[PDB]
Task: inverse folding
């Protein structure tokens, strides 16, 4: 019965035409609750999840996100030269947040990447840093010697994140609890004398799902390919599995789909 | 290996002449700059929208592009992806499954 | 966080 809050921060030297150079996406469990970007310069809730938000709270989120924008711009102007890299474009990333476990205990997370590679991590429980390489080590030693970062982020992860997680869970409880059954389609195309049975589960929420193929009532994983779980724009998800089958055996296979919206797992055929 | 991994799929199970949403999801790539273009018979679809740039636990980037459309049995739909790791644009054809 | 040096 645990819950999670995560922030995904990206700064970019070359985001693409018309693209913000700095973006924040925030998630509560597997649901986007709000975003920030350097073009609008405003942090805004996803009103479908959070329909009655007070401006005070998002004034606060905006300010804090704008500070993150300045720091990422600061880093992107200094780190490429410190790494002696000739790369054209550069990226800076950070993911941080907290978990509240079922028994009420707390976990904090705080990790950075530069050009898509581990850079620095902070462990709130020990209040210690980990550098990914000797260049990041210089930052680690500076941060820990000044002492201020550990205190700020122990408070941020262990107190502020937890408070906001509880707020978002309450404010967005209708959205978070509303289950959406998948619509399952099973298809078959016959190429080169073999039949590909594909199973597609459309538009489910929440995110966890399993899809298995069976023959004569016995699961068959060795010949199965899974497409993975991918997003729809409305907060639901999509997932798929395929298996290759002799066309003469096409009626003997069953797709098994298990989802929290289904009291019992669903069995589907071609 | 940091090339985009691309899936094309409709929001709802597809049925000719019934309104739907076409999705093109690219993931696993770096750097984040990417062109993703939904197309009907080689013509960009109108009203397409893209997700705010985000990334996976392994730091690789991800982007979903979607557009409302009404699948025609007479038409070919596809997603054109253009990225620094690719020397030429990659066109991913939607399998309609109907 | 600024990655000072
Ligand atoms: C240096 O490490 C920069 C730290 C940046 C922290 C910014 C956190 C912003 C939180 C609110 C985001 C609201 C939008 C989802
Ligand atoms: Cl059908
Ligand atoms: Cl049937
Ligand atoms: Mg149309
Ligand atoms: Na079906």
Result:
């Amino acid at each position: 019965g645990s819950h999670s809050l995560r922030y995904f921060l990206t700064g970019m030297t070359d985001p693409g035409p018309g693209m913000p150079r700095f973006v924040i996406v925030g998630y509560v469990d597997d649901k986007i609750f709000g975003t920030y970007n350097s073009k609008s310069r405003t942090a805004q809730p996803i009103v479908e999840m959070l329909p009655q938000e007070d401006q005070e709270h998002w004034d606060t989120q905006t300010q804090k996100a704008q500070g993150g924008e300045r720091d990422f711009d600061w880093n992107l102007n200094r780190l490429p030269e410190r790494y002696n890299k000739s790369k054209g474009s550069h990226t800076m990333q950070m993911m941080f947040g907290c978990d509240i476990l079922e028994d009420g205990s707390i976990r904090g997370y705080d990790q950075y990447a530069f050009d898509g590679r581990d850079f620095l991590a902070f462990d709130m429980d020990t209040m210690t840093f980990t550098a990914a390489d000797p260049v990041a080590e210089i930052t680690k030693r500076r941060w820990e010697t000044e002492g201020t970062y550990a205190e700020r982020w122990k408070h941020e992860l262990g107190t502020v994140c937890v408070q906001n997680l509880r707020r978002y869970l309450e404010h967005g409880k209708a959205a978070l609890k509303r289950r959406v059954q998948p619509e399952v389609r099973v298809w078959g195309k016959e190429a080169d004398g073999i039949l590909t049975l594909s199973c597609h589960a459309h538009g489910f929420y929440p995110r966890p799902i399993t899809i298995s193929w069976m023959k004569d009532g016995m699961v068959r994983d060795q010949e199965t390919r899974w497409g993975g779980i991918v997003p729809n724009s409305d907060g639901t998800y999509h997932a798929s599995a395929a298996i290759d089958v002799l066309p003469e055996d096409g009626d003997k296979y069953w797709c098994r789909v298990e989802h929290a919206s289904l009291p019992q797992p669903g069995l589907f055929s071609w | 290996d940091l090339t985009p991994k691309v899936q094309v799929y409709s929001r709802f199970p597809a049925s000719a002449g019934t309104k739907n949403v076409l999705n093109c999801f690219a993931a696993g790539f770096h750097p984040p700059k990417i062109s993703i273009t939904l197309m009907k018979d080689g013509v960009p679809m109108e009203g397409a929208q893209y997700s705010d740039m985000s990334f996976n636990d392994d730091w690789t980037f991800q982007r979903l592009v979607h557009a409302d459309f009404t699948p025609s049995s007479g038409s070919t739909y596809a997603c054109k992806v253009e990225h620094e790791t690719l020397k030429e644009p990659q066109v991913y054809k939607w399998d309609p499954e109907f | 966080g600024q990655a000072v040096s």
